[PDB]
Design a binder for these strands. Structure first.
Length: 298
DNA sequence: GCACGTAGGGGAGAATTGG
RNA sequence: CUUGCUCGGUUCGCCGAGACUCCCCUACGUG
DNA sequence: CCAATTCT
């Protein structure tokens, strides 16, 4: 399942003010300060409505309005599974230390001498019982089924300056021709460049790509982001993920490029089929402002 | 101290069911 | 092959050659 | 209609 990455275009509130992330941060801060004995008593978390309403009331951890079961089994299963990772990290190395004790022992009966002194075992919990190398907060907002990207609709989805594309209509194939533009119009190829163009089928960049305008010592092209950041919005492909009262609109063009260069899909594909080649569980990065889609088994 | 290999733990659904 | 990114050419209009398994966290070396 | 359920 190779990755695929898309850019966020709209955002009701930042991803750090989201109850899905506010709860997630609160859950693991409470957990990462447990002793090896408090975790066992507090590690009886179910995958049900009643159990999660028991865990979130017995263990104090506040809920900011988040009571979605499918979005609380990606927070309470990841947190405790990373918790055991630190102890496992210790005892997958200490195991090799007690395998090292085997290594020194094996030669020892051959010599016949009594076994030599060996290193002791090092735990992962400090003197107070709290974990020594306490994990850090994962900022990733993992998505669940009932909230998956869907095509943007101007009617039902909230009013937003954009253009909506019907699933039924196949996604258009941009800049089909290259040299058919008259002089001056953004996209015009000068006549001298027309000889010695590519005879091979490669990715085609559009005139407002940053790679075409990136500053470098040999370039004298003026960068004005009041134009290269407005032409792209009209031609964008919006897909929306709506958690509660909060909605993210992304740019599906990052998925359209992926299928093209990997041979999965041709020029004529619907938005449904484009979104149907990927998992319905994006991964979000609040700091970068990016969403990471994944493929399927085929 | 920014920077870097590195090493090593974790993570990256979706088909039925029921009010 | 419409976004993003890297190394280049340009009459400055956009053209050539590419990369694509990524993210989080905690450790230990290099000056 | 759409959350909660059970399995890899």
């Amino acid at each position: 399942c190779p990755p695929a990455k898309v850019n966020i275009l709209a955002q009701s509130r930042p991803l750090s003010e989201w109850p899905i992330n506010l709860v997630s941060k609160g859950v693991q801060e409470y957990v990462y300060g447990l002793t090896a004995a408090e975790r066992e008593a507090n590690g009886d978390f179910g995958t049900s409505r009643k159990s999660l309403d028991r865990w979130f009331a017995r263990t104090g951890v506040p809920t900011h309005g988040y009571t979605t079961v499918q979005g609380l089994n990606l927070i309470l299963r990841h947190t405790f599974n990373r918790y055991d990772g630190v102890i496992k990290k210790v005892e997958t190395r200490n195991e090799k230390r007690r395998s090292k004790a085997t290594r020194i022992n094996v030669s020892r009966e051959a010599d016949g001498l009594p076994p030599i002194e060996a290193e002791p075992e090092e735990t992962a919990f400090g003197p107070d019982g709290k974990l020594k190398e306490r994990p850090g907060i994962n900022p990733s907002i993992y998505c669940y089924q009932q909230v998956s990207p869907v095509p943007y609709n101007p009617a039902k989805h909230p009013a937003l300056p954009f253009s909506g594309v019907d699933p039924g209509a196949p996604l258009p194939l941009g800049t089909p021709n290259r040299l058919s533009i008259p002089k001056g119009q953004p996209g015009y190829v000068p006549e001298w460049q027309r000889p010695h163009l590519s005879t091979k089928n490669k990715r085609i960049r559009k005139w407002y790509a940053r790679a075409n305008w990136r500053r470098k010592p040999g370039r004298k092209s003026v960068l004005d982001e009041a134009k290269l950041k407005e032409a792209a919005l009209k031609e964008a492909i919006p897909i929306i993920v709506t958690i509660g009262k909060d909605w993210i609109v992304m740019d599906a063009r990052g998925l359209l490029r992926a299928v093209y260069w990997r041979g999965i899909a041709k020029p004529g594909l619907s938005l449904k089929e484009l979104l149907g080649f990927f998992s319905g569980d994006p991964v979000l990065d609040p700091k970068r402002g990016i969403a990471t889609f994944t493929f399927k088994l085929g």
